[PDB]
Design a binder for this molecule. Structure first.
Ligand SMILES: CCOP(=O)(O)[C@@](O)(CCC(=O)O)[C@H]1SC(CCOP(=O)(O)OP(=O)(O)O)=C(C)N1Cc1cnc(C)nc1N
Ligand SMILES: CCOP(=O)(O)[C@@](O)(CCC(=O)O)[C@H]1SC(CCOP(=O)(O)OP(=O)(O)O)=C(C)N1Cc1cnc(C)nc1N
Ligand SMILES: [Mg+2]
Ligand SMILES: [Mg+2]
Ligand SMILES: [Mg+2]
Ligand SMILES: [Mg+2]
Lengths: 855, 846
């Protein structure tokens, strides 16, 4: 036969090989540190021969040039892992073509960005040699690349770009991308802060955020740009950014829950190479990308891949070929780009935005670069990486190289290039001198943020009977032909009954609070593991048609007034992924993104929230004091000693009480359905943006004593301290009391039952419903009503090193010495675990506490 | 026609798995060219095959009960190896092998239906709908024994846990029934304990048809799904290092196999999965490949897969380390066993991870008291029509003529009758009184007067090792002074913190101990202080001075070794791995170092669920050391605190030792005590940063040769100098670096009326030594606990409450001197830190 047929078969193989594996041979590294193949008779003599390609006839030389330019020069394209053929086709059409050369104006603009990037760093090196700044030097191309992302988003008519990033070039991005004034950055280096800058305990300069407006230079549009605050914990901000963006999209009615699919707020997430591969929160956050409850229509990721992590080489930081391989699991295309090629970096940035817009999904840019100086500006890197730094020492920076290219192209002269650099440096010198001339302020110890947010003078949380009845009736206002599961129907009927007749249980009180907020126009977002039904089969926020699988959400009916007009409210209820770190981070972020939303995250059991410890420690408990960033997120933590073992017993009350300071969080363990209802309504309506930690029940959901009357919802309020009903409403005599038992949570009912059984008029039980801030005034006033008390005990089911005793045992006698001197503890022994593993052992220990309290 | 065939072969290999008949629920060119011959790359050379035959091979390999994902793998030899085994005829099992697979399905289902009958009201997380897990695991272990491997170590969650314990590991049925009965012997009832579906076991597996045996173990775990994953890897790595197999071994057998089970919702959602996979090829952590099994029942409690993950498969995360993925229909026992054996063979051939995604279903509710039709009515209507895998396989064998119905029933009734007999025997045992759980504190006790001092010759040897450079080695010019200073300190004293650490580890190595040290940038040290490894300035070659201590002066080995690594940028998986390693080799000295103590909260699940509580819950002992750089230096709220207060709150029952040493010699003695005491309990050390280079924080040679660990330290002026204790009216109790600032202030103002006492060991509290020290100051009228940490942090929250209760004649009236209570661990400003620090010093001497 004709050997052109064999040769053509090799050409088809070559095209497939460049598309699939060309990235492995691409010239992406600016440092350049690193017989049995059947050719089917194809050789260098066939370069001028025409071959069949799938439709079109082209020379081998031309096929090879297109493939080499697309896949083996300064851009390594990874996309053949993507399931959708239309997405592979979209990328092929855009990468397998001769690109239009940028205009001289565009080239000068890119150079102005590289000038600003390097000169900002060398200026800080000259003025503040002894201070850490985590310089971008060796990765200056990040600045024209981020400019190109934002400019392309503005071109698509998008509303906002929200950035999260680590330390690398942070100050540079704040000044040269977001627009944080140079004067402000210099004042941070000077340590000369005004009262607004010195507010709260604060944080380091490379953790701060900013907001501004990006104005296009080549078009008629502009776009909002924000950069969120973060702790040192690398990648921890990733789910926070997604939550922040989702809240903004929901507000704009764009995205998943919106009337249009614009997803008009873009998450722009930066990463370091060692952190992106090593931190599990990265995989957890990527796992949220296509979920109905969390999708943001695609995140644009940029890895500042300087092929080092402090002193650690990539071979000790990851097991994958690329630091970006984790992102392929959600079908993200990956673009590896040579950081010494500013034009390729800007081109990839615009392509990434276009892909995100076309398919509303994640895209990753792996910018290969290097770190000119040590990890921080005081560290010597040649001690551990002598070869890398011998190579770095021979390298001209990307600014110098790009300037030489423009001088060579005839675009600019050396004199013009020199003058432009001196002008920008002169501007920095002027601002530096102006800041240095400012009046120095006296340095004082940091101050508590407690008084910055206070409850409004007037706020009622009580609702009328009509509201309770409406929420009860909503549970039986089923869509026509809907088939309720036969074991769910009694719950719906019981809710209508409770709404009109009382004996309201915990699960219905929660829905009365959320339903009444929705009716008042509030957005309520509730999520967690199996949260739609409830772990304890108690919530049924969503019910499923037994015959069709169709879903009905009773509380959504409260978003429409009886006359048919919308209230402005909405109920967004989701089953989360099996994640704690990313889920809690997302809900924290969501509440920051929309301060007017009611946002609740529910742990399956409180015992699993330690999986989100970095978010609790670094954002929830401390973001207000450190950054002035406010969150109103609610954490619901099922808690209680029931004999189910050490991972089904405790939300670690003691840890949240230890973290507590400056009124940063509200911490509560309500004992009645009505008090929980009032707590949630207070939290949603007070205008205070501070997290709420609630220790919620499990068996107490179905305790027939733990029910509330209609008047507790219509004629009461949140009560931080509760007395026994026999003293406030009944015929109980407070003067007969000689022993006072102070407690919190479900053990109250067991203590009250024992009191009734033995007719102990000499013992009274007082509940502390709000654990923090301690209700000092209400507690003192309650105790003053018992003048004949001779002994006081703090009773708890938790071990002695757990529960409220570690905090209360120390704070109550100090804060109220005339009431709690001599306060003694009644609890389980101190334990390494939160409880015994045996239900029988739990029961014997529980009885010991009750016997000791009445002994 | 020819071009259509090569692209058709590539389509089946790359995407055939998307059309494979893998789900047991089933919830979701020209036609005249069939007899034409085409050239293909055969497994024994180029072949000419009919398109009809090419298509039948591709459909059987990639579109029946096995979905093969492998074309993401970079190595062409690995893709070829998989093709050779999947694109050829599979070995048909013998009748005896088929009967053996059926015996495993019988045990799997009958164990569950027996527990359903006897204990209807107790959770057991039944394997029903996934019984093929049992012959699958049997096949993995049997194939490992066929390769002559030493041990299989299993970690798994709740799904079929009791079933695996009884039918794979060999945990006695009498023991499992006693747990359901709640009638435990004193050993079973020891400590606070844990739920039955978290327990472990060990035994010996004997091949049914071959001539080998293999050890099989299953480790304990908390409820926290996937948290045990890095613990399993650490446990296996420690066992491999002991056997001289694997990464640091004389052979590349990696003869201890990690077998890691997962649930589908947990595998996709928990970040510790990606962190643990990321360790798989690292020199410090590699175990030569893990075999993963996902019991993929297409549900997570009430949650559908579309709400649990964003990837096509729950296993997609594993593709990042080039693991092949085998998706297999759980209703096909023979395909499940075949994939299991193929996975072992792949792991042995390439010493890398392999994933088996077993598609199955959950017959009952999430737990046996939950009603799943409320949220998944369609799935459970389909499940209600399904014949189980045991019934279906029995019908196949009866139809094949292998067995009769009578033989099938007799075999099932025999197993059930044996369960009934053991159940009756356990139920006949008298029930005794249930008591409150007891503290494990007295279970482990330090020997009387343990000597940790070393002689001058040992110190000198470790100093001299720093300049015993390999021939032609070029030391970096800024590293050479450190090596020279170490030789000087070894012979002349003024030993600093970093050298005291290396004197402790070096002397343990010389005594024959394995020392494993790792953490972020730990080879050099975050504060450029350690230099455990030095790099040749001209060639990049590495030299490890302490490795020289593994050889005696006469040339014989000591038996010791120094394994020092830079970790991945992980806290959760790294801490879990080091905990696991210490469990795997109790004789090893194992230390993990946080970059700053402020980042160890990233490993909170390991601290809470394994380190602080594993002894009380499971009787599992770990001697892992956590080194947490800590101290108020003005570097911000994430470069200041290891959260001492949290470790002291977690502390109970003597489960951990917690210390904040103030001198290099006291740290040396602490490490040597920990390595030589024969006690297996974690040690938490709050270590210094600026104090590494504080010229006052240096130790004398006699502190190493003639002393021991001191849990309480007095000022040198009273123990050795001419200081008068009777002049003291104010006592300052403290811990850590603030001692030096308090001592400097006392010397500057000549304050003979003030004494400073350090508590070096924070937990267990040194009650006797503290009381005896305070008794030496009879004229003290006021006592203060001084700390740089905020009032709600540091040792005050625990000491403020415990010291007046345990020593009332010494600490009644104890007052606090500290920073105010704070939401963050410190101010963000170095200038603000400095003003606050001066306030503490002024208050202490006010
Ligand atoms: C002295 C070492 O610690 P550190 O420098 O103080 C710091 O904490 C800095 C970040 C910060 O504090 O904001 C950082 S910088 C760094 C190396 C990062 O490498 P890569 O991701 O490749 O980024 P890069 O190459 O651009 O740097 C680690 C491990 N540090 C400590 C650290 C540990 N673990 C976690 C979760 N977060 C951290 N910040
Ligand atoms: C009542 C719900 O909580 P729970 O059942 O008590 C439990 O804690 C059980 C495990 C245990 O406690 O050991 C488990 S079972 C489960 C669903 C798992 O689904 P999948 O991975 O697909 O496995 P499966 O389908 O085989 O079940 C969750 C979320 N539970 C709570 C939980 C949450 N978060 C973490 C990190 N670990 C957990 N154990
Ligand atoms: Mg890096
Ligand atoms: Mg609020
Ligand atoms: Mg599952
Ligand atoms: Mg020990």
């Amino acid at each position: 036969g004709d050997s052109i047929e064999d040769k053509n078969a090799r050409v088809i193989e070559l095209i497939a090989a460049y598309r699939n594996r060309g990235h492995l041979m691409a010239d992406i590294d600016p440092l350049r540190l690193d017989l049995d193949v059947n050719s089917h008779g194809l050789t260098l003599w066939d370069l001028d021969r025409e071959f069949k390609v799938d439709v079109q006839r082209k020379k081998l030389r031309d096929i090879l040039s297109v493939l080499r330019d697309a896949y083996c020069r300064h851009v390594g394209v990874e996309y053949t892992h993507i399931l959708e053929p239309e997405q592979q086709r979209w990328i092929q059409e855009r990468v397998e073509t001769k690109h239009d050369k940028p205009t001289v104006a565009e080239q000068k603009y890119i150079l102005s960005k590289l000038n600003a990037a390097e000169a900002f760093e060398t200026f800080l090196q000259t003025k503040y040699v002894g201070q850490k700044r985590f310089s971008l030097e060796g990765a200056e191309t990040v600045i024209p690349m981020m400019d190109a992302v934002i400019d392309q988003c503005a071109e698509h008519g998008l509303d906002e770009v929200v950035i999260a990033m680590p330390h690398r070039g942070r100050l540079n991005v704040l000044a040269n991308i977001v627009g944080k004034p140079y004067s402000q950055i210099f004042s941070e280096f000077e340590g000369n802060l005004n009262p607004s800058q010195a507010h709260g305990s604060g944080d380091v300069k490379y953790h701060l955020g900013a907001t501004g407006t990006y104005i296009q230079m080549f078009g008629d549009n502009d776009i909002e740009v924000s950069l969120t605050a973060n702790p040192s914990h690398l990648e921890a901000v990733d789910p926070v950014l997604e939550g922040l963006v989702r809240a903004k999209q929901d507000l704009l009615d764009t995205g998943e829950e919106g009337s249009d699919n614009r997803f008009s707020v873009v998450p722009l997430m930066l990463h370091g190479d060692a952190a992106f591969a090593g931190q599990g929160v990265v995989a957890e956050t990527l796992n949220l990308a296509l979920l109905r409850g969390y999708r943001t229509g695609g995140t644009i990721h940029i890895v500042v891949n300087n092929q080092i992590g402090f002193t650690t080489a990539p071979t000790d930081s990851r097991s994958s070929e690329y630091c970006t391989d984790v992102a392929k699991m959600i079908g993200a295309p990956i673009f590896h780009v040579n950081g010494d090629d500013p034009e390729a970096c800007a081109w990839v940035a615009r392509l990434a935005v276009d892909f995100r817009q076309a398919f509303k999904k994640d895209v990753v840019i792996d910018m290969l670069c290097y770190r000119r100086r040590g990890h921080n500006e005081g560290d010597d890197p040649s001690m551990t990486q002598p070869y890398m730094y011998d190579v770095i020492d021979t390298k001209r920076g990307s600014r110098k190289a790009y300037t030489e290219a423009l001088i060579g192209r005839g675009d600019i002269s050396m004199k013009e290039a020199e003058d432009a650099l001196r002008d920008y440096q002169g501007q920095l010198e002027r601002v530096f001198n102006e800041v240095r001339e400012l009046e120095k302020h006296e340095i004082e110890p940091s101050e508590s943020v407690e008084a910055d947010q206070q409850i409004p003078s007037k706020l009622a949380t009580a609702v009328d009977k009509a509201m309770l009845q409406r929420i009860g009736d909503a549970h039986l206002a089923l869509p026509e032909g809907f088939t309720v599961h036969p074991r769910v129907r009694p719950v719906l009927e019981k809710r209508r009954e409770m709404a009109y007749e009382g004996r309201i249980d915990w699960a219905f009180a929660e829905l009365l609070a959320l339903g009444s907020l929705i009716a008042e126009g509030k957005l309520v977002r509730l999520s967690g593991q199996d949260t739609q039904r409830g772990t304890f089969t108690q919530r049924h926020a969503v019910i499923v048609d037994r015959k069709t699988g169709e879903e009905f959400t009773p509380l959504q009916l409260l978003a429409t007034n009886p006359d048919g007009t919308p209230t402005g409210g909405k109920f967004l209820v989701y089953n989360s992924a099996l994640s704690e770190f990313a889920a809690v981070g997302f809900e924290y972020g969501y509440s920051v993104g929309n301060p007017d939303a009611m946002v609740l995250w529910e742990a399956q059991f409180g015992d699993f929230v330690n999986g989100a410890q970095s978010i609790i420690d670094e954002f929830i408990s401390s973001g207000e004091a450190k950054w002035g960033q406010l969150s109103d997120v609610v954490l619901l933590l099922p808690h209680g000693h029931e004999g189910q073992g050490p991972d089904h017993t405790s939300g670690r009350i003691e840890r949240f009480l230890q973290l507590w300071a400056e009124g940063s969080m509200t911490i509560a363990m309500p004992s009645t359905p009505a008090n929980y209802f009032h707590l949630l309504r207070r939290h949603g309506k007070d205008g205070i943006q501070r997290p709420l930690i609630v220790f919620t029940p499990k068996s107490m959901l179905r305790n027939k004593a733990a029910v509330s009357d209609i008047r507790d919802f219509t004629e009461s309020k949140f009560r931080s301290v509760l007395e026994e009903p026999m003293y406030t409403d009944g015929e109980g005599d407070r003067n007969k009391v000689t022993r006072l038992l102070l407690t919190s949570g479900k053990i109250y009912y067991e203590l009250a039952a024992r009191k009734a059984k033995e007719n102990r008029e000499d013992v009274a039980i007082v509940r502390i419903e709000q654990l923090a801030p301690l209700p000092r005034r209400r507690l003192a006033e309650t105790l003053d009503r018992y003048p004949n008390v001779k002994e006081k005990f703090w009773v708890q089911e938790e071990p002695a090193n757990q529960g409220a005793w570690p905090s209360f045992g120390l704070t109550l006698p100090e804060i109220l010495p005339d009431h709690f001197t001599g306060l003694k503890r009644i609890s389980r022994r101190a334990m390494s675990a939160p409880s015994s593993g045996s239900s029988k052992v739990h029961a014997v220990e529980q009885q010991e506490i009750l016997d000791t309290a009445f002994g």
